[PDB]
């Protein structure tokens with residue numbers, strides 16, 4: 001098969017996908033719906049892609065497109081999920097889901113709660129989320145690749161953010177991603 005990776009190039013992920021004897025191409029810029037990049041692609045994986053996939057592409061790749069999203073869906077769809085999970089004191093974790101129209105709303109394939117600890121920062125929690133989802137993907141991709149797996153419908157509810165929603169809270173992040181999370185818990189509530 002031919003896999004299209006949307007998002008940044010990552011050596012471990014290229015090597016993993018290629019170990020199954022699949023053909024792997026990667027792209028991280030805006031993807032026009034008639035682009036030849038999609039010619040003969042059999043499966044789409046997005047991880048870290050910063051553009052919304054065109055609906056015509058989504059429908060064309062029904063049940064052949066997944067997204068690796070570092071939130072516990074349905075909470076924190078969209079942008080900066082790790083940050084919002086502390087600002088809004090929400091469930092924390094990672095989710096692999098089929099891509100459907102709209103913004104991180106598709107069927108859940110598997111998810112995992114990720115805990116945080118005393119002294120964690122936005123950096124340490126983000127890196128933990130990242131390790132969790134990458135191992136989870138490695139565990140499940142053998143099944144996903146063979147269509148040996150289906151999802152369950154993602155419940156409506158949870159939450160959704162856009163990039164600009166965090167602007168009024170940036171002043172709390174005095175150490176950038178090294179800001180301790182304890183300082184942020186629930187700051188967007190009340």
Ligand SMILES: CC(=O)N[C@H]1[C@@H](OP(=O)(O)OP(=O)(O)OC[C@H]2O[C@@H](n3ccc(=O)[nH]c3=O)[C@H](O)[C@@H]2O)O[C@@H](C)[C@H](N)[C@@H]1O
Nearest residue numbers: 047048049050051069070079080082083122123126163177
């Ligand atoms: C709006 C958008 O398009 N988002 C991308 C993606 O973005 P991302 O790939 O995860 O990078 P982000 O911009 O969040 O961070 C860049 C770097 O800053 C560091 N960092 C950041 C935040 C944090 O809490 N702690 C921390 O340490 C770390 O090194 C990280 O790599 O997020 C996905 C969930 C979206 N599905 C989408 O794909």
